[PDB]
Symmetry: D2
Subunit: 116 residues, 4 copies
């Protein structure tokens, strides 16, 4: 899988389930153009965002709707959402995992980048 997103929950110690995720790619004129979207599964993961064909060198933005996740749980959190912006594939094709660990007032993100 060229690109995958995992969301964990640090308050309950569980996967973050059914979290909406939106991906954008910067167009050649400096505008954000819609690239993919989905909701996280039961194990906090979202696969099949894209293919190796269409996942070319570029700047991408991953937006995770953290606010909606917390409210659905009865919690009013701090952040409107969490976004990860990064250059991809600028040194040949890699497989990417964007992970995020969430709390109401904090979040952490990391990327796992491997050569297939």
């Amino acid at each position: 899988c060229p690109l995958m997103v995992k969301v964990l929950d640090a308050v309950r110690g569980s996967p973050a389930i059914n979290v909406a995720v939106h991906v954008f790619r910067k167009a050649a004129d400096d505008t954000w153009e819609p690239f993919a979207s989905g909701k996280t599964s039961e194990s906090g993961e979202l696969h099949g965002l894209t293919t190796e064909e269409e996942f070319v060198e570029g700047i991408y933005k991953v937006e995770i709707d953290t606010k909606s996740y917390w409210k659905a749980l009865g919690i009013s959190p701090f952040h409107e959402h969490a976004e990860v912006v990064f250059t991809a594939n600028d040194s040949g094709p890699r497989r990417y995992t964007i992970a995020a660990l969430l709390s109401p007032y904090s979040y952490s993100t990391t990327a796992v980048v491997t050569n297939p």
Copy 2:
């Protein structure tokens, strides 16, 4: 101080020094309007962004230029930058500290919110 930003560096175990920071506030028409900016000091901190007078109820965006920090150090990092989006003062005036801990492929952010 109504609003303050601290940046730490997890690779060297030090403050993140001279990091550019930009703050925006959402205008009544859903556009991001420039609110404040600065660079972090020697202790990784940025004070005097605003005053209690002008820091009213609203949605704010704090953008930290992580990429430029790493490059100035001879490192090519993963993220273009880091941004924190949050509602402020929706329950009366609070003092806010936005903290970020950085690594080339990861970052963590939290908010310390206190009642003065």
Copy 3:
């Protein structure tokens, strides 16, 4: 898998490979008694630590040798190692994932706890 350990690397954005892990369980006399050990695979993961039979209610300690990982890479890190201490199965059998994200001067740990 009743218990599994994943180690990621935040400086290179990759799995932490071949990291030694030791697990202890507190004995009925308040002493740490050896329970299991292993090294992380290529995807930063360590499976087959134990079985559901022997993984009973108790206090466990997971020790990750972070120091040795960094040195093998040519880095002198801050911590001697990282340890996670937790009660397990005190409310019936759960599956546990202990995750750790590492940098030379920082680390983060979380647990994913699910009901099978």
Copy 4:
């Protein structure tokens, strides 16, 4: 201050107040010998652990009683506590800040190490 400890709370977005902290130093025979202790103040901080005189080159262990903090708040957390083990002053005297960000099922720690 040669050594200081700060504890933050990621569920409430506040300092972690009145958290017990214990420091040990490894003795020349490989045993942990009691070095200092305290409770965090209202701003989540614990100062005056030691002096530059007695804070010599060595391996130290900082133990933060996270469990007691959460229970006092009406929360049953995952970890028994959090401990940071590190070598100090092996390259001349430094000032150390050990920071920890806590959630019931997760915690993060970093060190800020500066040359005075």
